[PDB]
Structure formats: C-alpha cells, structure tokens
C-alpha cells in the first residue's frame, strides 16, 4: 500500500533536460548521470538514475513508483542512499535520481583491498585498517537504527547492498524489498516461520559484519545450503571467526546470531557498542 502514498512534485520533480545520462551501473536499469542544479546550487553533480527497460509494463512502472514513494517516506539519513529528485511527468521516461556512490558495493571493494590491509596500523599510505572496518560497521548500524525508527525492515541486508562513497561514508541501498511494520543472510525464524522483523535484520547485520571482517568473503565457506545447513543453524551451529576480526567483533556477530530474536541486540544497542569499539581502536 505504497502506491497510495503522495508525490509532492514541487519538492521532488527534476527537469529531464537538466539530466545528462552517462554509463550504466548495471543490470530496471541504473545509469550514472550528470544533473545540473539538483541540490539547488549552480553545480553539475554526478548522480545515479534508476529508469525502466524498453518494455514498460504497468507492474514495472508501479514498482518503480513505489520505490520512489518509499524513499520519500523514509526520509534522509547520511547512511542510506538518498533520493535527490525524480522525473515522473508525461514528457519522457520514469527516472529516480539518487546520490552516486563512486566506489560501488562494499563486498567488491573489500575484496579488492585484501593485499592492501593492515590492522591497527609506518605510513603505508592507502590501506584499510581495523578502524575503517569498525567505522563501516558502525555506519551501517546507524543506517539500520534509522530505518528501524521509520518502521522499516530491509530484508536483504548484505555487503553487496552497502555502497561506498567518498570520505569513507557507506550507505545502505536496495529499498526495493523494504517493508513497513538469499538464505545465508536469513534468520532461522525467517527460514522456518517466514518471519521478518527488525530483529531478523539484526541477524543479517551479523552476517554483514562477518563479510566486513573477512574482507568480502562469501558466508559459510564451502558449506552446502541444504536441509542439513538449516538443521545445523537451528541447533545453534555458527560460522567461525573471520580472518580479520577482533575478538570483540566476533562476539558481536555471535550476539546478532542469537537463536531468540528478542535476545539479539537492537540496532540502537549496536550503535552504542560499535561506537565504543571505534573509540577503543582510537
Ligand atoms: C553496484 O554497481 C555500482 C554502483 C555504483 N554506485 C551507485 N551509487 C548509488 C546508487 C547505485 N545504484 C545501483 C542504484 C541507484 C538507484 C536505485 C534505485 C532507485 N533502486 N535501486 C538503485 C540502485 N549505485 C558504482 C559502481 O561503480 C562505480 C558500481 O559498479 C558498477
């Protein structure tokens, strides 16, 4: 019921003749673009634009319109990919304009920096450290506490859906399955009972932490995702600690993977706790 939602064109509508489309960013289609005056200043800024494919079904146009209204409803936060404007009027294609994250998804970035990482550390001069990793974790937690306060469940929280921007700002994206009230990231109650709550997102956040402190490895390495895996997960079997974690961060993963959803930390508690780890590293 996010079709009903209002669209204030005065606030959001951006003229199509001030958008210059660039290279595709993959796969609905996302394209890199240049927008003049989208923050109301006299500047040409790089943005990302979701538009439709050459087919134009009603359900596809409905879906994208729903994405837009959900983003308007959610509101702005530093640690989500924010809406800048949209092109919705009868002139041309439906286009949703968001902030461009120039480094792409966090899983891929982290993988590309495995020989450019050192923990806690004589002027290497470009490398990732534990500080960065804990900083990214803290930021996603902040983004999730925000989404939780807007009464959303993400339902697909994974490093590939975290985007990296300039100045080490990470942003939660993919709100196409965000609701109001892939198995290796899924909580047991969501696997077995089909449940989704903010506390199920906490479990996924735990898998995301494992992804961060493995530098973008795939969860449950070499494990068959079958009826046994789900047995083991129900029982209480968990991933071992990844290669680049601290003890404290692995403990937080285990906490997020509590069997009882109400016994997992809330995102506010994770923001508190991760904030303390960040300052302890520093
Ligand atoms: C993941 O691929 C890259 C992304 C990006 N950067 C980027 N920044 C912001 C958004 C965004 N995306 C994909 C997007 C935008 C709008 C929507 C909407 C309405 N729904 N979903 C959206 C998804 N992609 C940069 C890359 O290399 C530099 C990538 O590697 C090719």
């Amino acid at each position: 019921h996010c079709e009903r939602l209002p669209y204030d064109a005065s606030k959001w509508e951006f003229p199509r003749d001030r958008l210059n489309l660039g290279k595709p960013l993959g796969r609905g289609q996302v394209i890199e673009a240049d927008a003049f005056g989208i923050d109301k200043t006299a500047t040409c800024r790089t943005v990302a634009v979701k538009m439709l494919k050459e087919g134009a079904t009603h359900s596809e146009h409905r879906a994208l319109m729903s994405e837009l209204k959900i983003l308007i409803h959610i509101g702005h936060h530093l640690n989500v990919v924010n809406l800048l404007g949209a092109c919705t009027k009868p002139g041309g294609p439906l286009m949703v304009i968001v902030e461009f994250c120039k480094f792409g998804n966090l899983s891929t970035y982290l993988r590309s920096k495995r020989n450019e990482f050192v923990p806690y550390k004589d002027l290497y001069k470009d490398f990732l450290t534990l500080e960065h990793l804990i900083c990214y974790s803290f930021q996603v937690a902040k983004g999730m506490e925000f989404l939780a306060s807007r009464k959303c469940i993400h339902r697909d929280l994974a490093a590939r859906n975290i985007l990296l921007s300039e100045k080490n700002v990470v942003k939660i994206c993919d709100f196409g399955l965000a609701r109001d009230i892939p198995l290796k990231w899924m909580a047991p109650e969501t696997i077995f009972d089909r449940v989704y709550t903010i506390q199920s997102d906490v479990w996924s956040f735990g898998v995301l932490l494992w992804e961060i402190f493995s530098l973008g490895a795939s969860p449950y390495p070499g494990v068959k995702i079958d009826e046994e895996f789900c047995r083991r997960l129900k029982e209480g079997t968990r991933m071992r600690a990844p290669d680049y974690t601290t003890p404290e961060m692995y403990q937080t993963m285990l906490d997020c993977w509590h069997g009882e959803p109400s016994q997992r930390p809330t995102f506010s508690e994770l923001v508190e706790h991760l904030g303390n780890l960040l300052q302890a590293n520093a």
Side-chain angles (χ1 to χ4, degrees), residues 24-26 29-32 47-51 64 67-68 71 81 83 96-105 160 163-164 173-176:
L25 291 176
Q29 59 185 319
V30 180
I31 303 197
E32 194 178 332
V47 297
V49 184
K50 172 111 173 221
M51 61 198 307
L64 184 48
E67 277 204 49
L68 169 59
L71 291 167
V81 181
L83 188 65
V96 177
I97 315 173
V98 301
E99 293 169 340
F100 179 57
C101 301
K102 83 169 323 199
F103 298 108
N105 86 76
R160 69 172 167 282
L163 293 191
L164 183 57
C173 72
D174 256 335
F175 303 93

mmCIF file of all heavy atoms in Angstrom, residues 24-26 29-32 47-51 64 67-68 71 81 83 96-105 160 163-164 173-176, ligand 1:
data_model
loop_
_atom_site.group_PDB
_atom_site.id
_atom_site.type_symbol
_atom_site.label_atom_id
_atom_site.label_comp_id
_atom_site.label_asym_id
_atom_site.label_seq_id
_atom_site.Cartn_x
_atom_site.Cartn_y
_atom_site.Cartn_z
ATOM 1 N N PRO A 24 25.949 2.993 -17.860
ATOM 2 C CA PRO A 24 25.189 2.113 -16.984
ATOM 3 C C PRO A 24 26.016 1.607 -15.805
ATOM 4 O O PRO A 24 27.217 1.368 -15.932
ATOM 5 C CB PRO A 24 24.762 0.938 -17.892
ATOM 6 C CG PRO A 24 25.455 1.106 -19.174
ATOM 7 C CD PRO A 24 26.058 2.471 -19.238
ATOM 8 N N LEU A 25 25.341 1.475 -14.673
ATOM 9 C CA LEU A 25 25.887 0.913 -13.444
ATOM 10 C C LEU A 25 25.291 -0.473 -13.196
ATOM 11 O O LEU A 25 25.424 -1.020 -12.105
ATOM 12 C CB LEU A 25 25.571 1.830 -12.255
ATOM 13 C CG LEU A 25 26.300 3.166 -12.241
ATOM 14 C CD1 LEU A 25 25.820 3.998 -11.083
ATOM 15 C CD2 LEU A 25 27.817 2.980 -12.196
ATOM 16 N N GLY A 26 24.597 -1.013 -14.199
ATOM 17 C CA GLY A 26 24.338 -2.442 -14.270
ATOM 18 C C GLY A 26 22.888 -2.891 -14.310
ATOM 19 O O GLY A 26 21.961 -2.121 -13.988
ATOM 20 N N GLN A 29 16.911 -0.392 -14.979
ATOM 21 C CA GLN A 29 18.335 -0.089 -15.213
ATOM 22 C C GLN A 29 18.830 1.129 -14.446
ATOM 23 O O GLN A 29 18.141 2.155 -14.352
ATOM 24 C CB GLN A 29 18.654 0.066 -16.701
ATOM 25 C CG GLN A 29 17.897 1.147 -17.422
ATOM 26 C CD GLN A 29 18.200 1.138 -18.903
ATOM 27 O OE1 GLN A 29 19.356 0.961 -19.306
ATOM 28 N NE2 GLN A 29 17.161 1.310 -19.730
ATOM 29 N N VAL A 30 20.029 0.987 -13.892
ATOM 30 C CA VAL A 30 20.691 2.070 -13.218
ATOM 31 C C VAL A 30 21.811 2.627 -14.095
ATOM 32 O O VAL A 30 22.640 1.891 -14.622
ATOM 33 C CB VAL A 30 21.220 1.639 -11.866
ATOM 34 C CG1 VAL A 30 21.918 2.806 -11.179
ATOM 35 C CG2 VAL A 30 20.065 1.119 -11.021
ATOM 36 N N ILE A 31 21.813 3.947 -14.236
ATOM 37 C CA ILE A 31 22.797 4.662 -15.036
ATOM 38 C C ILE A 31 23.422 5.821 -14.246
ATOM 39 O O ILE A 31 22.761 6.493 -13.432
ATOM 40 C CB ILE A 31 22.152 5.189 -16.336
ATOM 41 C CG1 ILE A 31 21.538 4.015 -17.108
ATOM 42 C CG2 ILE A 31 23.184 5.870 -17.212
ATOM 43 C CD1 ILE A 31 21.241 4.297 -18.572
ATOM 44 N N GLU A 32 24.719 6.007 -14.463
ATOM 45 C CA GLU A 32 25.435 7.155 -13.964
ATOM 46 C C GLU A 32 24.996 8.340 -14.822
ATOM 47 O O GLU A 32 24.740 8.174 -16.007
ATOM 48 C CB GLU A 32 26.935 6.893 -14.073
ATOM 49 C CG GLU A 32 27.815 7.850 -13.297
ATOM 50 C CD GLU A 32 29.287 7.507 -13.413
ATOM 51 O OE1 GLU A 32 29.627 6.320 -13.616
ATOM 52 O OE2 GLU A 32 30.120 8.427 -13.299
ATOM 53 N N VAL A 47 25.195 11.798 -10.459
ATOM 54 C CA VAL A 47 24.126 11.141 -9.728
ATOM 55 C C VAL A 47 23.945 9.744 -10.310
ATOM 56 O O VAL A 47 24.556 9.422 -11.335
ATOM 57 C CB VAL A 47 22.807 11.950 -9.802
ATOM 58 C CG1 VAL A 47 22.966 13.377 -9.111
ATOM 59 C CG2 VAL A 47 22.308 12.053 -11.237
ATOM 60 N N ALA A 48 23.122 8.927 -9.648
ATOM 61 C CA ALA A 48 22.710 7.628 -10.161
ATOM 62 C C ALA A 48 21.218 7.658 -10.453
ATOM 63 O O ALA A 48 20.440 8.198 -9.682
ATOM 64 C CB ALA A 48 23.051 6.499 -9.152
ATOM 65 N N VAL A 49 20.818 7.052 -11.560
ATOM 66 C CA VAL A 49 19.443 7.126 -12.021
ATOM 67 C C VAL A 49 18.929 5.738 -12.349
ATOM 68 O O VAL A 49 19.491 5.036 -13.215
ATOM 69 C CB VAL A 49 19.312 8.014 -13.284
ATOM 70 C CG1 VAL A 49 17.845 8.160 -13.705
ATOM 71 C CG2 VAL A 49 19.963 9.370 -13.042
ATOM 72 N N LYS A 50 17.855 5.361 -11.649
ATOM 73 C CA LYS A 50 17.112 4.146 -11.948
ATOM 74 C C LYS A 50 15.992 4.510 -12.911
ATOM 75 O O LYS A 50 15.145 5.346 -12.609
ATOM 76 C CB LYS A 50 16.538 3.528 -10.666
ATOM 77 C CG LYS A 50 15.569 2.351 -10.885
ATOM 78 C CD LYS A 50 16.135 1.033 -10.425
ATOM 79 C CE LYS A 50 15.101 -0.083 -10.486
ATOM 80 N NZ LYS A 50 15.172 -0.978 -9.288
ATOM 81 N N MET A 51 16.002 3.884 -14.076
ATOM 82 C CA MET A 51 14.926 4.049 -15.037
ATOM 83 C C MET A 51 14.492 2.676 -15.509
ATOM 84 O O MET A 51 15.102 1.670 -15.146
ATOM 85 C CB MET A 51 15.371 4.929 -16.205
ATOM 86 C CG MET A 51 16.536 4.412 -17.019
ATOM 87 S SD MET A 51 17.290 5.726 -18.015
ATOM 88 C CE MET A 51 15.872 6.403 -18.897
ATOM 89 N N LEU A 64 8.477 0.845 -9.673
ATOM 90 C CA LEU A 64 9.449 1.932 -9.558
ATOM 91 C C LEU A 64 8.831 3.139 -8.853
ATOM 92 O O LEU A 64 9.482 3.787 -8.035
ATOM 93 C CB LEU A 64 10.026 2.323 -10.933
ATOM 94 C CG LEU A 64 11.143 3.398 -10.964
ATOM 95 C CD1 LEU A 64 12.228 3.100 -9.950
ATOM 96 C CD2 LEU A 64 11.768 3.526 -12.368
ATOM 97 N N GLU A 67 9.018 2.325 -5.151
ATOM 98 C CA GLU A 67 10.385 2.612 -4.691
ATOM 99 C C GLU A 67 10.551 4.088 -4.320
ATOM 100 O O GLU A 67 11.075 4.425 -3.256
ATOM 101 C CB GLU A 67 11.422 2.284 -5.785
ATOM 102 C CG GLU A 67 11.855 0.817 -5.887
ATOM 103 C CD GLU A 67 13.238 0.666 -6.525
ATOM 104 O OE1 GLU A 67 14.172 1.370 -6.085
ATOM 105 O OE2 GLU A 67 13.403 -0.155 -7.450
ATOM 106 N N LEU A 68 10.101 4.956 -5.221
ATOM 107 C CA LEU A 68 10.277 6.407 -5.078
ATOM 108 C C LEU A 68 9.548 6.926 -3.839
ATOM 109 O O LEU A 68 10.127 7.639 -3.003
ATOM 110 C CB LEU A 68 9.784 7.139 -6.341
ATOM 111 C CG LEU A 68 9.634 8.671 -6.332
ATOM 112 C CD1 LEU A 68 10.944 9.385 -6.025
ATOM 113 C CD2 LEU A 68 9.056 9.152 -7.660
ATOM 114 N N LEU A 71 11.124 5.820 -0.555
ATOM 115 C CA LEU A 71 12.280 6.661 -0.265
ATOM 116 C C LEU A 71 11.879 8.049 0.245
ATOM 117 O O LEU A 71 12.473 8.566 1.194
ATOM 118 C CB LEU A 71 13.168 6.790 -1.493
ATOM 119 C CG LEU A 71 13.933 5.543 -1.953
ATOM 120 C CD1 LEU A 71 14.496 5.770 -3.363
ATOM 121 C CD2 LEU A 71 15.052 5.175 -0.976
ATOM 122 N N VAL A 81 21.294 5.480 0.948
ATOM 123 C CA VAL A 81 21.359 6.130 -0.351
ATOM 124 C C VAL A 81 20.162 7.058 -0.476
ATOM 125 O O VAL A 81 19.027 6.591 -0.499
ATOM 126 C CB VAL A 81 21.359 5.097 -1.508
ATOM 127 C CG1 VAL A 81 21.445 5.777 -2.882
ATOM 128 C CG2 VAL A 81 22.537 4.072 -1.330
ATOM 129 N N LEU A 83 17.478 9.949 -1.906
ATOM 130 C CA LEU A 83 16.738 10.480 -3.032
ATOM 131 C C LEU A 83 17.094 11.943 -3.234
ATOM 132 O O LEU A 83 17.115 12.715 -2.290
ATOM 133 C CB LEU A 83 15.243 10.330 -2.738
ATOM 134 C CG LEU A 83 14.270 10.656 -3.852
ATOM 135 C CD1 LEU A 83 14.418 9.687 -5.029
ATOM 136 C CD2 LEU A 83 12.853 10.619 -3.291
ATOM 137 N N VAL A 96 14.349 7.731 -11.346
ATOM 138 C CA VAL A 96 14.512 8.006 -9.929
ATOM 139 C C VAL A 96 15.968 8.373 -9.656
ATOM 140 O O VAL A 96 16.870 7.605 -9.917
ATOM 141 C CB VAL A 96 14.052 6.803 -9.072
ATOM 142 C CG1 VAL A 96 14.282 7.057 -7.579
ATOM 143 C CG2 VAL A 96 12.566 6.503 -9.343
ATOM 144 N N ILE A 97 16.194 9.561 -9.126
ATOM 145 C CA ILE A 97 17.535 10.118 -9.049
ATOM 146 C C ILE A 97 18.033 10.101 -7.600
ATOM 147 O O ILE A 97 17.445 10.730 -6.724
ATOM 148 C CB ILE A 97 17.580 11.565 -9.564
ATOM 149 C CG1 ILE A 97 16.798 11.740 -10.876
ATOM 150 C CG2 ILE A 97 18.999 12.016 -9.761
ATOM 151 C CD1 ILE A 97 16.708 13.218 -11.289
ATOM 152 N N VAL A 98 19.135 9.384 -7.380
ATOM 153 C CA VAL A 98 19.726 9.253 -6.067
ATOM 154 C C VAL A 98 21.194 9.670 -6.057
ATOM 155 O O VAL A 98 21.815 9.886 -7.096
ATOM 156 C CB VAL A 98 19.629 7.794 -5.527
ATOM 157 C CG1 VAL A 98 18.179 7.349 -5.437
ATOM 158 C CG2 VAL A 98 20.454 6.825 -6.388
ATOM 159 N N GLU A 99 21.722 9.776 -4.844
ATOM 160 C CA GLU A 99 23.137 10.057 -4.596
ATOM 161 C C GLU A 99 24.012 8.973 -5.212
ATOM 162 O O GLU A 99 23.690 7.789 -5.088
ATOM 163 C CB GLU A 99 23.374 10.097 -3.085
ATOM 164 C CG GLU A 99 22.675 11.266 -2.416
ATOM 165 C CD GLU A 99 22.667 11.213 -0.887
ATOM 166 O OE1 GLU A 99 22.869 10.101 -0.297
ATOM 167 O OE2 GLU A 99 22.409 12.312 -0.284
ATOM 168 N N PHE A 100 25.080 9.382 -5.898
ATOM 169 C CA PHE A 100 26.025 8.459 -6.563
ATOM 170 C C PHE A 100 27.119 8.073 -5.590
ATOM 171 O O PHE A 100 27.759 8.934 -4.978
ATOM 172 C CB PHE A 100 26.661 9.089 -7.815
ATOM 173 C CG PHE A 100 27.668 8.188 -8.525
ATOM 174 C CD1 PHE A 100 27.297 6.927 -8.988
ATOM 175 C CD2 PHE A 100 28.972 8.610 -8.738
ATOM 176 C CE1 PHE A 100 28.205 6.106 -9.644
ATOM 177 C CE2 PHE A 100 29.897 7.793 -9.386
ATOM 178 C CZ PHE A 100 29.518 6.537 -9.842
ATOM 179 N N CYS A 101 27.311 6.771 -5.429
ATOM 180 C CA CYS A 101 28.383 6.248 -4.592
ATOM 181 C C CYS A 101 29.463 5.728 -5.546
ATOM 182 O O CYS A 101 29.260 4.741 -6.265
ATOM 183 C CB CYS A 101 27.831 5.175 -3.666
ATOM 184 S SG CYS A 101 26.493 5.826 -2.599
ATOM 185 N N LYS A 102 30.587 6.431 -5.581
ATOM 186 C CA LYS A 102 31.581 6.220 -6.645
ATOM 187 C C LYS A 102 32.398 4.932 -6.529
ATOM 188 O O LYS A 102 32.970 4.489 -7.523
ATOM 189 C CB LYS A 102 32.520 7.440 -6.781
ATOM 190 C CG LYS A 102 33.705 7.474 -5.807
ATOM 191 C CD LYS A 102 34.779 8.556 -6.148
ATOM 192 C CE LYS A 102 35.016 8.761 -7.663
ATOM 193 N NZ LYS A 102 36.333 9.437 -7.978
ATOM 194 N N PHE A 103 32.454 4.338 -5.338
ATOM 195 C CA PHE A 103 33.236 3.106 -5.113
ATOM 196 C C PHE A 103 32.447 1.799 -5.244
ATOM 197 O O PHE A 103 33.016 0.711 -5.095
ATOM 198 C CB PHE A 103 33.966 3.178 -3.762
ATOM 199 C CG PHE A 103 34.943 4.299 -3.697
ATOM 200 C CD1 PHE A 103 34.687 5.416 -2.925
ATOM 201 C CD2 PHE A 103 36.086 4.273 -4.476
ATOM 202 C CE1 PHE A 103 35.572 6.479 -2.896
ATOM 203 C CE2 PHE A 103 36.978 5.340 -4.462
ATOM 204 C CZ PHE A 103 36.721 6.444 -3.668
ATOM 205 N N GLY A 104 31.152 1.899 -5.534
ATOM 206 C CA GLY A 104 30.327 0.721 -5.756
ATOM 207 C C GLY A 104 30.101 -0.029 -4.466
ATOM 208 O O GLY A 104 30.218 0.551 -3.385
ATOM 209 N N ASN A 105 29.765 -1.310 -4.572
ATOM 210 C CA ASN A 105 29.334 -2.088 -3.408
ATOM 211 C C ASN A 105 30.510 -2.463 -2.516
ATOM 212 O O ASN A 105 31.630 -2.668 -2.996
ATOM 213 C CB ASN A 105 28.538 -3.340 -3.839
ATOM 214 C CG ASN A 105 29.429 -4.535 -4.163
ATOM 215 O OD1 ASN A 105 29.947 -5.199 -3.258
ATOM 216 N ND2 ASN A 105 29.576 -4.837 -5.453
ATOM 217 N N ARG A 160 26.896 -6.456 -0.320
ATOM 218 C CA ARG A 160 26.612 -6.085 -1.703
ATOM 219 C C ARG A 160 25.541 -4.990 -1.803
ATOM 220 O O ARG A 160 25.443 -4.314 -2.821
ATOM 221 C CB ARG A 160 26.171 -7.312 -2.523
ATOM 222 C CG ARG A 160 24.797 -7.847 -2.113
ATOM 223 C CD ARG A 160 24.232 -8.945 -3.012
ATOM 224 N NE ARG A 160 23.083 -9.563 -2.335
ATOM 225 C CZ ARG A 160 23.171 -10.454 -1.343
ATOM 226 N NH1 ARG A 160 24.349 -10.885 -0.903
ATOM 227 N NH2 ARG A 160 22.071 -10.926 -0.779
ATOM 228 N N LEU A 163 26.833 0.553 -0.123
ATOM 229 C CA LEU A 163 27.575 1.254 -1.134
ATOM 230 C C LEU A 163 28.570 2.183 -0.470
ATOM 231 O O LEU A 163 28.269 2.784 0.560
ATOM 232 C CB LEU A 163 26.627 2.053 -2.048
ATOM 233 C CG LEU A 163 25.681 1.262 -2.953
ATOM 234 C CD1 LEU A 163 25.018 2.191 -3.981
ATOM 235 C CD2 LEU A 163 26.388 0.080 -3.665
ATOM 236 N N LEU A 164 29.744 2.308 -1.085
ATOM 237 C CA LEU A 164 30.813 3.122 -0.542
ATOM 238 C C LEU A 164 30.965 4.391 -1.337
ATOM 239 O O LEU A 164 31.045 4.383 -2.571
ATOM 240 C CB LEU A 164 32.142 2.364 -0.511
ATOM 241 C CG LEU A 164 33.361 3.079 0.105
ATOM 242 C CD1 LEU A 164 33.142 3.545 1.553
ATOM 243 C CD2 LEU A 164 34.577 2.150 0.014
ATOM 244 N N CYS A 173 21.718 0.629 0.594
ATOM 245 C CA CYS A 173 20.850 0.762 -0.560
ATOM 246 C C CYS A 173 19.880 -0.414 -0.681
ATOM 247 O O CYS A 173 19.647 -1.132 0.278
ATOM 248 C CB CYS A 173 21.683 0.959 -1.823
ATOM 249 S SG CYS A 173 22.532 -0.485 -2.367
ATOM 250 N N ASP A 174 19.304 -0.582 -1.868
ATOM 251 C CA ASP A 174 18.230 -1.551 -2.119
ATOM 252 C C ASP A 174 17.117 -1.467 -1.081
ATOM 253 O O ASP A 174 17.115 -2.162 -0.071
ATOM 254 C CB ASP A 174 18.775 -2.985 -2.276
ATOM 255 C CG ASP A 174 18.799 -3.441 -3.732
ATOM 256 O OD1 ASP A 174 18.003 -2.899 -4.527
ATOM 257 O OD2 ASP A 174 19.595 -4.348 -4.077
ATOM 258 N N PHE A 175 16.178 -0.576 -1.363
ATOM 259 C CA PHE A 175 14.939 -0.462 -0.610
ATOM 260 C C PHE A 175 13.761 -0.993 -1.438
ATOM 261 O O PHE A 175 12.606 -0.652 -1.180
ATOM 262 C CB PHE A 175 14.730 1.001 -0.210
ATOM 263 C CG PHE A 175 15.862 1.555 0.584
ATOM 264 C CD1 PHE A 175 16.906 2.218 -0.038
ATOM 265 C CD2 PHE A 175 15.912 1.373 1.956
ATOM 266 C CE1 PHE A 175 17.959 2.711 0.701
ATOM 267 C CE2 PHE A 175 16.958 1.865 2.685
ATOM 268 C CZ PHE A 175 17.978 2.530 2.060
ATOM 269 N N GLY A 176 14.065 -1.852 -2.413
ATOM 270 C CA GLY A 176 13.049 -2.465 -3.263
ATOM 271 C C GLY A 176 12.282 -3.582 -2.579
ATOM 272 O O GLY A 176 11.238 -4.012 -3.069
HETATM 273 C C1 LIG B 1 26.598 -1.549 -7.749
HETATM 274 O O1 LIG B 1 27.134 -1.161 -9.014
HETATM 275 C C2 LIG B 1 27.772 0.055 -8.852
HETATM 276 C C3 LIG B 1 27.140 1.099 -8.211
HETATM 277 C C4 LIG B 1 27.777 2.315 -8.060
HETATM 278 N N1 LIG B 1 27.184 3.417 -7.405
HETATM 279 C C5 LIG B 1 25.829 3.587 -7.064
HETATM 280 N N2 LIG B 1 25.601 4.657 -6.300
HETATM 281 C C6 LIG B 1 24.334 4.856 -5.960
HETATM 282 C C7 LIG B 1 23.307 4.045 -6.347
HETATM 283 C C8 LIG B 1 23.614 2.957 -7.134
HETATM 284 N N3 LIG B 1 22.577 2.094 -7.555
HETATM 285 C C9 LIG B 1 22.955 0.843 -8.196
HETATM 286 C C10 LIG B 1 21.196 2.333 -7.503
HETATM 287 C C11 LIG B 1 20.682 3.574 -7.831
HETATM 288 C C12 LIG B 1 19.331 3.852 -7.786
HETATM 289 C C13 LIG B 1 18.489 2.830 -7.391
HETATM 290 C C14 LIG B 1 17.085 2.681 -7.210
HETATM 291 C C15 LIG B 1 16.017 3.681 -7.401
HETATM 292 N N4 LIG B 1 16.772 1.445 -6.812
HETATM 293 N N5 LIG B 1 17.952 0.809 -6.737
HETATM 294 C C16 LIG B 1 19.019 1.595 -7.072
HETATM 295 C C17 LIG B 1 20.360 1.303 -7.109
HETATM 296 N N6 LIG B 1 24.880 2.741 -7.493
HETATM 297 C C18 LIG B 1 29.053 2.474 -8.561
HETATM 298 C C19 LIG B 1 29.679 1.430 -9.204
HETATM 299 O O2 LIG B 1 30.956 1.532 -9.732
HETATM 300 C C20 LIG B 1 31.484 2.838 -9.559
HETATM 301 C C21 LIG B 1 29.042 0.220 -9.353
HETATM 302 O O3 LIG B 1 29.670 -0.837 -10.002
HETATM 303 C C22 LIG B 1 29.251 -0.771 -11.366
#
